[PDB]
Enzyme design. Structure first.
Site, PDB file in Angstrom:
ATOM      1  N   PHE A  78     -25.243  32.183 100.038  1.00 44.49           N
ATOM      2  CA  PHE A  78     -25.439  31.460 101.150  1.00 44.49           C
ATOM      3  C   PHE A  78     -26.296  32.216 102.243  1.00 44.49           C
ATOM      4  CE2 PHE A  78     -23.804  28.591 104.827  1.00 44.49           C
ATOM      5  CZ  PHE A  78     -24.750  27.610 104.562  1.00 44.49           C
ATOM      6  N   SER A 153     -20.204  36.304  98.148  1.00 46.54           N
ATOM      7  CA  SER A 153     -19.692  34.995  98.200  1.00 46.54           C
ATOM      8  C   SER A 153     -20.217  34.155  97.290  1.00 46.54           C
ATOM      9  CB  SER A 153     -20.845  34.677  99.383  1.00 46.54           C
ATOM     10  OG  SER A 153     -19.843  34.032 100.752  1.00 46.54           O
ATOM     11  N   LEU A 154     -20.848  33.161  97.574  1.00 51.03           N
ATOM     12  CA  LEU A 154     -21.377  32.198  96.393  1.00 51.03           C
ATOM     13  C   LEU A 154     -21.987  32.775  95.161  1.00 51.03           C
ATOM     14  CD1 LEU A 154     -20.772  29.575  97.366  1.00 51.03           C
ATOM     15  CD2 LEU A 154     -22.622  29.696  99.002  1.00 51.03           C
ATOM     16  N   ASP A 177     -16.167  39.740  97.567  1.00 48.13           N
ATOM     17  CA  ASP A 177     -15.559  38.699  98.251  1.00 48.13           C
ATOM     18  C   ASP A 177     -16.089  37.322  98.123  1.00 48.13           C
ATOM     19  OD1 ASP A 177     -13.587  37.825 100.388  1.00 48.13           O
ATOM     20  OD2 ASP A 177     -15.351  37.396 101.753  1.00 48.13           O
ATOM     21  N   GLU A 188     -11.273  26.961  86.147  1.00 52.85           N
ATOM     22  CA  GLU A 188     -11.752  28.027  85.419  1.00 52.85           C
ATOM     23  C   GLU A 188     -13.477  27.765  85.428  1.00 52.85           C
ATOM     24  OE1 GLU A 188      -8.552  27.761  84.710  1.00 52.85           O
ATOM     25  OE2 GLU A 188      -8.491  29.832  85.491  1.00 52.85           O
ATOM     26  N   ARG A 191     -15.263  28.323  89.344  1.00 53.94           N
ATOM     27  CA  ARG A 191     -15.346  29.394  90.025  1.00 53.94           C
ATOM     28  C   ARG A 191     -15.402  30.581  88.843  1.00 53.94           C
ATOM     29  NH1 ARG A 191      -9.011  28.966  89.632  1.00 53.94           N
ATOM     30  NH2 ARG A 191      -9.790  30.740  88.143  1.00 53.94           N
ATOM     31  N   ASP A 193     -13.639  33.884  87.482  1.00 55.06           N
ATOM     32  CA  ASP A 193     -12.348  33.956  86.922  1.00 55.06           C
ATOM     33  C   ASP A 193     -12.523  34.757  85.551  1.00 55.06           C
ATOM     34  OD1 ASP A 193     -13.196  31.484  84.952  1.00 55.06           O
ATOM     35  OD2 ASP A 193     -11.387  32.209  84.173  1.00 55.06           O
ATOM     36  N   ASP A 196     -15.304  34.538  82.550  1.00 55.49           N
ATOM     37  CA  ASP A 196     -16.524  34.782  82.504  1.00 55.49           C
ATOM     38  C   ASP A 196     -17.302  35.899  82.212  1.00 55.49           C
ATOM     39  OD1 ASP A 196     -16.096  32.019  83.655  1.00 55.49           O
ATOM     40  OD2 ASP A 196     -15.965  32.818  85.639  1.00 55.49           O
ATOM     41  N   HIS A 264     -16.221  39.647 105.820  1.00 58.34           N
ATOM     42  CA  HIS A 264     -16.876  38.819 104.618  1.00 58.34           C
ATOM     43  C   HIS A 264     -18.105  39.828 103.909  1.00 58.34           C
ATOM     44  CE1 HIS A 264     -18.127  35.056 102.368  1.00 58.34           C
ATOM     45  NE2 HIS A 264     -19.042  35.976 102.084  1.00 58.34           N
TER      46      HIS A 264
END
Ligand SMILES: *[C@@H]1O[C@H](CO)[C@@H](O[C@@H]2O[C@H](CO)[C@@H](O[C@@H]3O[C@H](CO[C@H]4O[C@H](CO)[C@@H](O)[C@H](O)[C@@H]4O)[C@@H](O)[C@H](O[C@H]4O[C@H](CO)[C@@H](O)[C@H](O)[C@@H]4O)[C@@H]3O)[C@H](O)[C@H]2NC(C)=O)[C@H](O)[C@H]1NC(C)=O
Ligand SMILES: *[C@H]1O[C@H](CO)[C@@H](O[C@@H]2O[C@H](CO)[C@@H](O[C@@H]3O[C@H](CO[C@H]4O[C@H](CO)[C@@H](O)[C@H](O)[C@@H]4O)[C@@H](O)[C@H](O[C@H]4O[C@H](CO)[C@@H](O)[C@H](O)[C@@H]4O)[C@@H]3O)[C@H](O)[C@H]2NC(C)=O)[C@H](O)[C@H]1NC(C)=O
Ligand SMILES: CCCCCCCCOCCOCCOCCOCCO
Ligand SMILES: CCCCCCCCOCCOCCOCCOCCO
Ligand SMILES: [Ca+2]
Ligand SMILES: [Ca+2]
Lengths: 448, 87, 448
Positions: A78, A153-154, A177, A188, A191, A193, A196, A264
């Site tokens: 982001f 992040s994203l 993070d 799953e 996100r 997890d 992947d 973050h």
């Protein structure tokens, strides 16, 4: 709804992609033209100024990309773009330690929209990075093995897309993070997890909750190893006054970014350093963080500690489960490497009030003076603590002892019969003296 | 055990081998119930063709010969038991 | 809402325990008096008639329980009780192979209520079994290591409770076809999942979906190893006519249970046998089941195959990931052990139409006649297939060949120059002849 785009297939706004309650609103990804995922190549042959690839085999076969090497993708998140210095640092450090294809992944077109929007485009960003691995694999031969994808992040989630679409065959996905909002919860199939990739190691540097303390980070586990440096919620070096955080020593962009999302952002900070300090980030299983600070679980387990960051991939007990959490403490600035040692001192002299304080010397070098106890000092009590030395002393040869802040004209004397230091290794080194000293004086103990 | 339908799987119920896909409707005693079973294999017990249409031990898979008792007592007491064997 | 009970602590009806969408209704556990969890002990010293323990150390220290042995809990599930013969079988078989504490776990009070209800009480059943491990560990000394908990349907989840509350320290949890409805979905903190013990091996014998084909089993992975015998959805031996299923050879209770939940129930069937056939249940990694039946992934990988059922715990590649799926084929009745062999035959004689058919002979014994191909037989074509022999022949010495169902008065002859048999081991054995034979005749080939 559904959209479908040339290279990247179709994109449903169906649950659990939206509608589900932690992700209510129904919204689609943007055209793969707006996201505008770009792949900024950097190599040992070319730090400092990037090449640029699209999935087109000729492009990557006429580039400084080298498939006799190993590839690491770095996806921002982001409000960020794949140029931003943090992405280049990681390539630089990497180049010091390693010969590598360091693809920064820009999607700054996709990332500057609304949060919910941006969290939506990541499927595209995922799908781009996923497609790239594809052509490498099939057109070029380059096995999804040799890929390591790092995202912040994203971005970590993006890597989870790329990971998912690749049937979880990429060697490693690293989650600096991961973004909590509309991803923590969510199956799953939204996100990051452990599914992947072949190994998913997450660093949690801003967990604990958006409400009401404003954390963009993920409490949730995810991945195999799950490091919570400094206990996860409150990174040290982020409670500075406004002025000092903004006017920080890396310029007034960095201090504003740290002014905005300090805790973050630390995730890629810690990642960056760990490239260079292969041993400075050892993590510790414990039933808590409080129990760790409560000095109840040192040294490292017989298997090892995972190194947080770049070397978590070499832990032996690595894939051997899911949501293994570990705690370490890190610095407050920009070498963050620390080395936990446990020191217990036994006192001679007579009853005095004040602080004890020990400093380690070893074949590598020597340490600051770390406190150990403070209160009624008095002879024959053994006192202990462990502390996060910012110097790795190595194999100890001596230590020293020093105390302070109660002398009458009496000039009392206090000392240490024995101090034993335990490395995180597990070794205990024993040090003895029958001397005492008066306050603010350095008694050296020697190995008994 | 009633059966009354054709081309039964193993373990299904049969009055008679003509119903079973295996074409062996076996059952372990005279009072037990006939369920389809598989033709015995080389070296395992078998019976030669019975008129009773129901076996204590199956006929052998093709190519094999049940080599054992083919007496009279056996033919009536349905106990012409042999082992399967090649030629 | 919340209830709290004497030994077992409190019980919130808060998400993700209810309210969440795959588990909508808000309902609590029952009094630990209604569930009425009982612990039916069985040992080598006492098969056939059970002792009965409550968590009370004296009770278990004045019982045939032996803590120099190893403990296995067997939790039934919905609509069932811990006496039901299937739970005793597993103890019996276990006693043949092993000296053990085989605690059946009755909660027939809790299990006969409504489904949603029953799926709710399992937290209690979990919490009971959890508490029992506790007192063993702390009062008695008996490490949660030595515990292995096996559970079927709802019960697997119960074991996940016990596992969860025990901070995942129990050695093994086994999931004989976990219950799908309101558990598939639902966070780690509702279902079984690899976190609940040091090793969670699941057998899926009724996946594929409640709608509209009525499966009570879990599609979802869960646990480290994930076996889908017979491909998971349709257990062979369960499509019998009504009459034959109900009047089945183990009595007319078993056939009704198999009439009700045949596929679902097979899970403890397969588990029971595997105790006695240590090698009869080898499982095979594959990208699918269809791809496995399509004969595209044999023999066992260089590491091994997991044995499905009682011996999954000895796989080397065991904890070394999460949601590793494997496929094997099993029998249709109640020895279910099979042994996959691949056989390729190359034909001599001349063009004929019909079936080929091979049978293996080895130092252990010999096999049925398994088909291999059927169609235009004709010389020099090599044909192959793999089949699930119900005899483990061992080390091959010979094979034989036989064909059928096209002879003119011609009396054509067909034969096999070479047949090579590959065990799941990986070995290939070669067998040659220059003979032909006419139909329904057994040509033996010898090792070339
Ligand atoms: C990687 O992927 C496969 C591996 O075979 C290759 O070929 C097929 O690819 C499809 C997509 O084209 C495969 O299906 C995938 O399923 C995942 C969903 O979860 C299930 O995964 C397996 C099977 O059910 C179970 O074990 C597990 O428990 C889950 O139930 C998702 O990754 C994908 O589904 C989504 O993909 C599209 C496109 O991105 C989405 O928009 C869809 O709507 C959906 O959300 C994925 O499709 C398929 O089954 C594979 N075939 C075979 C025979 O196995 C790819 O080419 C290969 N690429 C690489 C880099 O290796
Ligand atoms: C198991 O644990 C230790 C032995 O070392 C003993 O003492 C403490 O035990 C407590 C509970 O007994 C431990 O706390 C547990 O907390 C977990 C909460 O979820 C998180 O799990 C960890 C801890 O924060 C994170 O890494 C993870 O990502 C989650 O944030 C839960 O698993 C438990 O809480 C929940 O379950 C209970 C348990 O019955 C529910 O009823 C609660 O309402 C809630 O839903 C659990 O309480 C603590 O860490 C231990 N520390 C230490 C030093 O011992 C236990 O008594 C011991 N028992 C045994 C056999 O090991
Ligand atoms: C569309 C105009 C620009 C939007 C204003 C942003 C205000 C705060 O931004 C600070 C810079 O971003 C750093 C924090 O990023 C958090 C998410 O992850 C980014 C990782 O690369
Ligand atoms: C469908 C026929 C009429 C109703 C039958 C109800 C009682 C069945 O109980 C007899 C024993 O059944 C054993 C199967 O139990 C587990 C089924 O589990 C379903 C969810 O897992
Ligand atoms: Ca994912
Ligand atoms: Ca669980």
């Amino acid at each position: 709804s559904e959209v479908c785009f040339p290279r990247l297939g179709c994109f449903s706004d169906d649950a659990p992609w939206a509608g589900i309650v932690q992700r209510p609103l129904k919204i689609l990804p943007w055209s793969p033209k707006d996201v505008d995922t770009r792949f900024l190549l950097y190599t040992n042959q070319n730090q400092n100024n990037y090449q640029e690839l699209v999935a087109d085999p000729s492009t990557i076969t006429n580039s400084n990309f080298r498939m006799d090497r190993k590839t690491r993708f770095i996806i921002h998140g982001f409000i960020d773009k794949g140029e931003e210095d943090w992405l280049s640092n990681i390539c630089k450090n990497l180049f010091k330690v390693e010969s590598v294809n360091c693809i920064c992944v820009d999607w700054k077109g996709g990332s500057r929209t609304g949060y919910t929007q941006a969290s939506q485009n990541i499927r595209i960003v995922g799908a781009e990075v996923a497609y790239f691995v594809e052509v490498l694999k099939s057109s070029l031969g380059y096995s999804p093995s040799n890929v390591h994808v790092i995202g912040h992040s994203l971005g970590s989630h993006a890597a989870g897309e790329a990971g998912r679409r690749t049937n979880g065959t990429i060697e490693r996905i690293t989650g600096l993070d991961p973004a909590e909002p509309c991803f923590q919860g969510t199956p799953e199939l939204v996100r990051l997890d452990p599914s992947d990739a072949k190994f998913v190691d997450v660093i949690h540097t801003d967990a604990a909750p958006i409400i009401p303390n404003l954390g963009f980070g993920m409490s949730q586990t995810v991945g195999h190893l799950d490091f919570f440096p400094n206990g996860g919620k409150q990174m040290p070096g982020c409670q500075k006054n406004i002025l000092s955080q903004i006017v920080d020593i890396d310029g007034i962009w960095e201090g504003t970014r740290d002014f905005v999302a300090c805790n973050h952002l630390r995730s890629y900070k810690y990642y960056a350093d760990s490239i260079l300090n292969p041993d400075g980030f050892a993590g510790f299983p414990c039933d808590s963080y409080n129990v760790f600070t409560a000095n109840k679980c040192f040294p490292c387990p017989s298997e090892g500690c995972p190194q947080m960051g770049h070397y978590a991939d070499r832990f032996p007990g690595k894939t051997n489960g899911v949501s293994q959490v570990f705690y370490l403490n890190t610095g407050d600035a920009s070498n963050f490497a620390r080395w936990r040692y446990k020191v217990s001192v036994t006192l001679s002299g007579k009853k005095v009030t004040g602080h004890i304080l020990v400093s380690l010397f070893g074949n590598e070098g020597n340490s600051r003076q770390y406190e150990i106890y403070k209160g009624t000092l008095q002879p024959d009590n053994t006192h202990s603590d462990e502390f996060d030395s910012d110097v790795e002393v190595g194999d100890l040869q001596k230590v020293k002892f020093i105390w302070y802040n109660v002398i009458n004209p009496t000039l009392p004397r206090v000392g240490a019969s024995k101090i034993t230091v335990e490395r995180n290794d597990g070794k205990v080194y024993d040090f003895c003296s029958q001397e005492t000293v008066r306050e603010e004086v350095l008694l050296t103990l020697n190995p008994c | 055990p009633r059966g009354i339908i054709i081309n039964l799987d193993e373990g299904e119920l049969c009055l008679n081998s003509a119903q079973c896909k295996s074409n062996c409707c076996q059952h372990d005693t005279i009072l037990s119930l006939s369920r389809c079973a598989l033709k015995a294999r080389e070296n395992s017990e078998c019976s030669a063709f019975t008129l009773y249409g129901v076996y204590y031990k199956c006929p052998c898979e093709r190519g094999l010969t049940c080599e054992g008792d083919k007496s009279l007592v056996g033919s009536i007491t349905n106990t012409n038991f042999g082992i399967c064997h090649n030629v």
